[model samples]
Target: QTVETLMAGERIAEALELGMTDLNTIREPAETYVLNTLQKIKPASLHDALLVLPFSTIPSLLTFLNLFAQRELNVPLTCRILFFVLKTHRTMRATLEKVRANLRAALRRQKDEMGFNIAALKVVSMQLR
Candidate 1:
């Protein structure tokens, strides 16, 4: 398990580097592959994978994260990664306005969906009772 996570972390680092390097012409496919690599990592090992990444890669990571959040792909995992990065690197700031805006919209949508489902469940429970 330890070795598996180590390998996954290294892959993530490489994917970020390659994705950033190919950002100009092959943006979508490279980013999509990067996101796939991120999603493939076990949730428990996400922190380890993130930790393996160098500080220089944060900007590229954040850019991909922004794309992920905007696309609404694995939003919970996306939020977890975003929060962890923010907490660990308090002094650093990139072009976060787009990320923040997109995340706020995504979070609001998810919250409203959850609230609706909860209300529906409550109504159904009341009817059953």
Candidate 2:
């Protein structure tokens, strides 16, 4: 479904409608919808959801960060989103190195194109630590 799909309640119910609810099927759509509609998610809900997302989301998390960095859209929201993924998925610790390396490279490229106040990125790296 598109970003114009139903609200969280409907999506949650839809995920459970396959007779036997499988998180894999539920997670993909749910994660997409939530990421696309982050503003609608409350803090508590977002925190809980991140704790249980499928491991499949790790790559997408990196891609989201890279896109934000590439666009020079340096902000805490993107950092927090990646931090959320990394913090919840302890088994994927190595992915943290990849995120940091990619973020640094992207920030370096963006720095050449614009002003380079990277304190927030440093904060992000610290949070990752």
Candidate 3:
């Protein structure tokens, strides 16, 4: 049972990485355990679903800043995962809500620690000149 759960967790993570998942009995269990027994080679690739902001526009940056401050952007991976969640939520609302508790804990984060959110909001007005 324990091994099955661990494999399930790994499979869940892989499904998240893939952006879509269709589960079946055959694809997993073994799929989870089969993932190399030796050193798990980690890939160094930035999986950014969010598009780059327009150089002239701050709306996108401001939106990101607000989202940033909300979910403890102190950690980049966390932020990237949040983006991943947002991207996935557009399709899978149920799975998205399953992570709500984790999200709430992260959002309850101190606001004073927030940086550049408002600054980016202001950037739009200032840059309009």
Candidate 4:
């Protein structure tokens, strides 16, 4: 089925499909599964997913951050995720400061020459992607 295949592809628009009456019904496990899968696949878009998710389900967003911590280095993904985090959560800034050194090194190693500017984004200022 196309719907099932798209869901497997991590296209969350399925959650909003009117014909997909079971959208929210599958949101919980689906969100978790997608997060884990993207962490291994297209990790760069995971943070964007959190930002895209309904704010009413903040628990799912927190679950995202938790699951992400368990993984090893995924630089661009981490940065994109943090951008969403910083855009949404102002409280985490102070805490993110503690790991500035490590994050800077990681960002430097994974610098996106074609897209992002390491110097401009100040990836060195914090422990972030």
Highest TM-score, which number? 1
Q: Tens-digit lDDT track for model 1 on 1-129?
A: 586776767788788888989996564578788888888877786676676668888888898888888998778877888877766554335356677678889999999999999999999999995
Please identify model 4 stretches exceeding 4 Å from their true place. 1-35, 40-48, 52-72, 109-129
| TM-scores of all candidate predictions against the true structure | 0.74, 0.44, 0.26, 0.35
What lDDT score goes with residue 101 in model 2? Answer: 65
Q: Show model 2 residue runs off by greater than 4 Å.
A: 1-36, 90-95, 102-129
Model 3 agreement with the true structure over 1-129: per-residue lDDT tens digits: 444434433442443333213223334833232223101422221122222222222222223333433545443444454464355333234434434445455655544335456777788989997
Q: How do all the candidates rank in terms of lDDT, highest first?
A: 1, 2, 4, 3
Local error of candidate 3 at 111, Å?
3.3
Candidate 3 lDDT score relative to the true structure: 0.37
**Candidate 1 residue 108 C-alpha distance from true site, Å:** 0.2
Model 4: clashing residue pairs? 100-126, 100-127
Please provide, for model 2 over 1-129, each residue's C-alpha lDDT reduced to its tens digit, 9 standing for 90 to 100.
Answer: 322232442343333233223334544733344334454555554544656555454455554455554454544455666777667665345656656666677656766645545776767789995
Report the candidate with higher TM-score, 1 versus 3: 1
The local distance difference test score of each candidate is 0.80, 0.51, 0.37, 0.47
Ranking by TM-score: 1, 2, 4, 3
